[PDB]
Every structure is written in C-alpha cells, then in structure tokens.
Coordinates of C-alpha atoms and ligand atoms in Angstrom, one line a residue:
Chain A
X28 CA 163.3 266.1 44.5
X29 CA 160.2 268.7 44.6
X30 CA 158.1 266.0 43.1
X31 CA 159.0 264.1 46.5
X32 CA 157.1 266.8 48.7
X33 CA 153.6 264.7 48.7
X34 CA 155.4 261.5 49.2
X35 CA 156.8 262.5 52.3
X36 CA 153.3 264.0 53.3
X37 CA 152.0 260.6 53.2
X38 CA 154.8 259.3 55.4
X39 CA 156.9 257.7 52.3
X40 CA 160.5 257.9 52.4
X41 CA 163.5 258.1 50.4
X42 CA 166.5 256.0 50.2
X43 CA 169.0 255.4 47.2
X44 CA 166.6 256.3 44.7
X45 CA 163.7 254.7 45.6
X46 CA 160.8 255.8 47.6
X47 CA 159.7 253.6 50.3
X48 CA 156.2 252.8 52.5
X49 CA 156.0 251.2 55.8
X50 CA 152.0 250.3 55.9
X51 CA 150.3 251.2 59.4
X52 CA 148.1 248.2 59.3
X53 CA 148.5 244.8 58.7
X54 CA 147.3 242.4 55.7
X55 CA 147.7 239.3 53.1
X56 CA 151.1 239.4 50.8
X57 CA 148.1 239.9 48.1
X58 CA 146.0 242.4 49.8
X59 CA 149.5 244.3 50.9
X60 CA 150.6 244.1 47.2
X61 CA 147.3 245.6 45.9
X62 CA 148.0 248.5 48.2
X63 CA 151.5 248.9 47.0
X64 CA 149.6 248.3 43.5
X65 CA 147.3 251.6 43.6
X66 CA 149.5 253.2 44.9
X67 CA 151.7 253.2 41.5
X68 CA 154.4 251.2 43.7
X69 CA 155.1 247.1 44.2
X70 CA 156.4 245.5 47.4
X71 CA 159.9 245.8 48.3
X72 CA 162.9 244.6 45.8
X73 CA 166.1 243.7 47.3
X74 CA 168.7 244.6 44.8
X75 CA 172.1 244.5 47.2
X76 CA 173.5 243.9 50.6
X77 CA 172.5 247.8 51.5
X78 CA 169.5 247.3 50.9
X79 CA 168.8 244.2 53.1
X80 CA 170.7 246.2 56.0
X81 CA 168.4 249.4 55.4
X82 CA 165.5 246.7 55.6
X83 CA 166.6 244.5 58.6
X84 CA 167.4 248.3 60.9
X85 CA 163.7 248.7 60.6
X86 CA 163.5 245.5 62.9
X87 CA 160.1 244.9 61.8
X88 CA 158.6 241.9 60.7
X89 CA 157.8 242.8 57.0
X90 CA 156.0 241.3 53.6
X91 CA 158.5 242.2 51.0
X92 CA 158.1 241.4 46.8
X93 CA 159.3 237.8 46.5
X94 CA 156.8 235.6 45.7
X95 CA 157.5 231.6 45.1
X96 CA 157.2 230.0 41.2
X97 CA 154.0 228.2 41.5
X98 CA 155.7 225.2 44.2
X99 CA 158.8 225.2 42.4
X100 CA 160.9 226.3 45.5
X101 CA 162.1 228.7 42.9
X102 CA 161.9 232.7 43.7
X103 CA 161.0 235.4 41.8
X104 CA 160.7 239.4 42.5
X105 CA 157.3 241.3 42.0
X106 CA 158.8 243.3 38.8
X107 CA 159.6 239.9 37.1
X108 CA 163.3 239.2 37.7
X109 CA 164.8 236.1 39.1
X110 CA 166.1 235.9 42.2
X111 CA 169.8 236.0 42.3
X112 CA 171.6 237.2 45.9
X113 CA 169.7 235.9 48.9
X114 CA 169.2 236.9 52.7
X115 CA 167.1 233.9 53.8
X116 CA 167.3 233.2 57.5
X117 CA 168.7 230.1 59.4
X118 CA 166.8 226.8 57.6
X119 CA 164.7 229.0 55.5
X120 CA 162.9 228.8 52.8
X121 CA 161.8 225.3 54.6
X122 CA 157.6 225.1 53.6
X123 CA 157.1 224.7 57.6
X124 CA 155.3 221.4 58.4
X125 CA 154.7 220.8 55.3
X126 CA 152.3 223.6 54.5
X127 CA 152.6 225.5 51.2
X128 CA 154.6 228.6 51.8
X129 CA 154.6 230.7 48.9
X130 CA 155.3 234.3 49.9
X131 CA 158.8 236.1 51.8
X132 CA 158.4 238.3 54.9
X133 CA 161.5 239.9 56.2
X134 CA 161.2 238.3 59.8
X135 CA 162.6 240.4 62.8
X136 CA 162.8 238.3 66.2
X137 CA 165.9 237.4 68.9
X138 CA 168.0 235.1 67.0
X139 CA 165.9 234.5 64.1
X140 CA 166.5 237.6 61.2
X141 CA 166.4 237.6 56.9
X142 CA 163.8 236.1 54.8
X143 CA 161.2 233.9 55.5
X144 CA 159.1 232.0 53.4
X145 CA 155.2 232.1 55.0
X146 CA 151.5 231.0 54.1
X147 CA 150.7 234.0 51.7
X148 CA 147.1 234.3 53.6
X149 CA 148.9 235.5 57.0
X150 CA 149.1 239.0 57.7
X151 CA 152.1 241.3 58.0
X152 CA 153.0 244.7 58.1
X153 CA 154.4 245.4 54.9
X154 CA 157.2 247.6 52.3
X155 CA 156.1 249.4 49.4
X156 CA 158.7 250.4 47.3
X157 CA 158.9 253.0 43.9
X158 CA 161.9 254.1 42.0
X159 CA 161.8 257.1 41.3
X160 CA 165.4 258.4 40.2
X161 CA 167.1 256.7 37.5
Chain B
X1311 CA 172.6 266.9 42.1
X1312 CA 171.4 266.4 46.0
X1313 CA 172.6 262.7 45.5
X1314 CA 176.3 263.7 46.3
X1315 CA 175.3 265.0 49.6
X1316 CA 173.1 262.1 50.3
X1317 CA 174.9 259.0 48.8
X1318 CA 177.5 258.4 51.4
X1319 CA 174.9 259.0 54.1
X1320 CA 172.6 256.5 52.2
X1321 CA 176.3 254.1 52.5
X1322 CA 176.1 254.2 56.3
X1323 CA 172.1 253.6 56.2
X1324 CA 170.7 256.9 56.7
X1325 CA 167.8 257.8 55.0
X1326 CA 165.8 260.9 53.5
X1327 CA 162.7 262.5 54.4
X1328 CA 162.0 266.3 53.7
X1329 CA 164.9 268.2 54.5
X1330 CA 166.8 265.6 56.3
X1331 CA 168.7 262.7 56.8
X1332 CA 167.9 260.3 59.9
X1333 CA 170.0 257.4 61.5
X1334 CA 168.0 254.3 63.6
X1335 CA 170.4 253.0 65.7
X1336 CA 170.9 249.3 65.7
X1337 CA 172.4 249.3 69.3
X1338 CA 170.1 250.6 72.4
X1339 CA 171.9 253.7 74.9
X1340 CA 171.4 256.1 77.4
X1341 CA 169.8 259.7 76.3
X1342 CA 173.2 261.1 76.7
X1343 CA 175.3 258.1 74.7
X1344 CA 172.7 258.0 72.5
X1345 CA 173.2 262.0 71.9
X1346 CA 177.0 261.3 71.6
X1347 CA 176.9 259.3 68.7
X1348 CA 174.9 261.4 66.9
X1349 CA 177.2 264.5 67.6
X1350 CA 180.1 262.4 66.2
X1351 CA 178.2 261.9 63.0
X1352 CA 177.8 265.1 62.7
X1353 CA 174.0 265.2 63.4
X1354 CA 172.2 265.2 66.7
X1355 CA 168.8 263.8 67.7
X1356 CA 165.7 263.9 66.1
X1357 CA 164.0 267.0 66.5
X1358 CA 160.2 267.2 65.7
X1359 CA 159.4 270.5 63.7
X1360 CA 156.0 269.4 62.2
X1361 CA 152.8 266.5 62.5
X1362 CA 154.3 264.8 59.5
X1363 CA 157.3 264.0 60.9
X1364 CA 155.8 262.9 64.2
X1365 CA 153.6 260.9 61.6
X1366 CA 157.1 259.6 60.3
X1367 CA 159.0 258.8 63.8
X1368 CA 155.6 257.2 64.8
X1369 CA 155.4 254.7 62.0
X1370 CA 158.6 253.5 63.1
X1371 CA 156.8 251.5 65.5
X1372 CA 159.8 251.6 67.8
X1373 CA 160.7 253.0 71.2
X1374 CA 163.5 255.8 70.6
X1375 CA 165.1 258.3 72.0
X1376 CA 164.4 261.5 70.6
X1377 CA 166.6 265.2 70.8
X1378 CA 164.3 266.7 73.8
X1379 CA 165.2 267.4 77.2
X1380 CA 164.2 269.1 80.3
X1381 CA 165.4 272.4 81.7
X1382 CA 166.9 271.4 85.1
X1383 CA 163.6 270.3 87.0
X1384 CA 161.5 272.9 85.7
X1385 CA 159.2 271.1 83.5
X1386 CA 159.7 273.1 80.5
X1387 CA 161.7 271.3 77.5
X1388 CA 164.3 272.5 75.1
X1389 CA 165.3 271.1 72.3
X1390 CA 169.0 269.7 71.7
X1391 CA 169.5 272.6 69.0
X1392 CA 168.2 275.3 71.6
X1393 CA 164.8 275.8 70.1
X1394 CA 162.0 275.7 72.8
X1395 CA 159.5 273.5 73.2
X1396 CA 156.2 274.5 71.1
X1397 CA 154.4 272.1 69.3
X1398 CA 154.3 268.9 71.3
X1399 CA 153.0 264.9 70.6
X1400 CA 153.3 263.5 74.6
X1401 CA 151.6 260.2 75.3
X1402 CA 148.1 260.6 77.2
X1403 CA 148.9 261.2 81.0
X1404 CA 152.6 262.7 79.8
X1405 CA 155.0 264.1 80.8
X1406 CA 154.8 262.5 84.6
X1407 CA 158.0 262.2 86.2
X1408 CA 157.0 258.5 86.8
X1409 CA 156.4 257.3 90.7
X1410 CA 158.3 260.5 91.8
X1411 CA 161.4 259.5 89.9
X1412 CA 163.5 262.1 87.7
X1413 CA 162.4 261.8 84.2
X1414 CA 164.7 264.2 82.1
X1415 CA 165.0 262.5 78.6
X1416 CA 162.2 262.2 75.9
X1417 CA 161.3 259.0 74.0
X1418 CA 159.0 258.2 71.6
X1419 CA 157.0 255.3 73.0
X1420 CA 155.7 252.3 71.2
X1421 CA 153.2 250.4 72.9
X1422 CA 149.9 248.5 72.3
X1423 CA 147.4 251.3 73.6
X1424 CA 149.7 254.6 74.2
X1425 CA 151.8 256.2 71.4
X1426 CA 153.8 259.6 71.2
X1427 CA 156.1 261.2 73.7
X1428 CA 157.1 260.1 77.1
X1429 CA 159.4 261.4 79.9
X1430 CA 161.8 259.1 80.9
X1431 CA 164.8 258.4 83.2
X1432 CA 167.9 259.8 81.5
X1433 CA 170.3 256.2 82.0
X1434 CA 167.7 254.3 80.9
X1435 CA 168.5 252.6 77.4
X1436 CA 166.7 252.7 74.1
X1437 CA 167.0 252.8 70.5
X1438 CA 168.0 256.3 69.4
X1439 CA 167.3 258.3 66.5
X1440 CA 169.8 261.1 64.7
X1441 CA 168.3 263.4 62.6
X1442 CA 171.0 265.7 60.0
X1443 CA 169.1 268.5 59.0
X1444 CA 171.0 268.4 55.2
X1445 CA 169.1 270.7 52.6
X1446 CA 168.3 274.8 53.4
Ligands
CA2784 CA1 164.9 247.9 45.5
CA2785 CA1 159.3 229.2 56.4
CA2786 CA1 163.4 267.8 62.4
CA2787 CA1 157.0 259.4 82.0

C-alpha cells in the first residue's frame, strides 16, 4: 500500500487488488497493449460480474485484453487464459459486414453497452491493468 | 490489512486512490441530491486537495458534480467539509455566473476544448462524484 504512492502519481488507481490505467489518448488494441506492456501491466482482464460493473460506470468506450484466436471466433485474455464468463453486447461478437474483427472494446453508447468485437487497427481509449496484491 | 476497510466499498464499486475511496454515480442529479446520496453513504462529494487528484477527476472524462459551493452570492467558495477555497482548477473564462443566471454549484466539465471547473446552476443535473476520505 506505500508501494502504490507513484501509481497514483501517475493517475493509476486501485480496485480489488489490482491497479488500473485509463490512457489519456487514444490508439490501436496493439499500440494500447504496448503501452500497458512498458508499463509492466497488460490490458484489462475481466475476471467477475464486479469487475464488468466497475468497467461499464466508467461509461467510456474502452480497449480491454481479449483478443480473438487467429479467426476462430474463439476468445482468449492477454495473460493466456480462455475465456469463460462473457459480457458481450446485443448481437455481438458479430465480425460487422463481414470485416475481420479480432480485438474487444468495452463499448459505451445509449442502448448499446458490454463487449464488442472491432477491427484491431481502430483506435480507442484504453484500460491497463496490474495486480498487484495477491 | 487496509483490505477490510476497503473490500465492501470495492462490493458497491468504489474505488481507491491515495487516501480515499470515490463513488461515480451511474444516475445523473441535482448538486444538492447528488450531495444527499453521498451523505447517506457515509461520504460526501469529491473534494480536490491536490493537482493529482484534479489529474484523477479529469481523466474521468466525464461532467460531474463535485463538493464545492458558493457562499451565498459572494463569489467566494467553500468546500462541503468547511475548508475554504485555495487551490483552484476553473475552466478558462470561470467562474461566470452564466448570462446573469445564479450559478452556485461546481462541476467538473468535460468538453472538446474547455476542461476543469465550472459554475453552474444548482438544479441542474449531472453525474456526481463521492469521495470517502478512509485512511489518516
Ligand atoms: Ca482483472
Ligand atoms: Ca462487432
Ligand atoms: Ca480529496
Ligand atoms: Ca459557469
């Protein structure tokens, strides 16, 4: 909890044991994971139902750490695991008009909230997250 | 060890940054509603104390209602735990009182070319953030 001093100087903050990062500019899903990247962090892993509500109260439109298996229309997180409990919004994942879409933003509009599956070469604000307490 | 305190805070969404725990509403109110709930969570609005948690509230990017108010009419600001106004973030061109209108209540504004704090009419609606001032 003192080691979380310079996080929170950089504008990081702290829920449930991880550390969290709203970027102030916007990028690719790769460019915003490199950021997370040197930062010693990854985009944002949903791990339960709080965590998607923490998320969504931002209402922001965000990249977050789910990434598509190759075009298997299968999901997995940036830390390697598989998805298992799901917040996809109404229709999605849907690879829009046929276009490959390969990377999950968090989308925040009037009717239309939860995951979304979008061209990775768009740009987003994005979430770092770090763990930090066990 | 400061994860009893904050666990059942972090249950109702709250979150932790330096000394305190902050609440973004996910309903939009007037200043004073806005204030109420905060009061009956045992917290009250956001006070600034320092640039990084300007920094913080501004990286929101999200209109809200923040724990500062005018005395009476006099153009000085308190605020909503006493303290008086020192340190100050107002938008370029504010505090205005708007087109002659009373504006009592402070928000942080979001908006493509002005950011920071703004005077505002009191019954007007918005976002609000509570801030719980938690560790010494
Ligand atoms: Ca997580
Ligand atoms: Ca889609
Ligand atoms: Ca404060
Ligand atoms: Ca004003």
């Amino acid at each position: 909890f003192d080691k979380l001093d310079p996080y929170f100087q950089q504008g990081w903050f702290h829920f449930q044991k991880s550390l969290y990062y709203i970027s102030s500019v916007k990028n690719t899903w790769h460019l915003s994971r490199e950021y997370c990247l040197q930062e010693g962090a990854d985009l944002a892993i949903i791990n339960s139902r709080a965590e998607q509500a923490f998320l969504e109260n931002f209402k922001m439109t965000l990249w977050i750490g789910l990434m598509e298996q190759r075009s298997e229309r299968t999901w997995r997180w940036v830390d390697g695991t598989p998805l298992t409990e799901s917040y996809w919004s109404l229709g999605e994942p849907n690879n829009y008009e046929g276009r490959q879409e390969q990377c999950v933003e968090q989308i925040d509009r009037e009717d239309k909230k939860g995951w979304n599956d979008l061209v990775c070469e768009f740009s987003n604000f994005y979430m770092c997250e770090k763990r930090i307490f066990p």
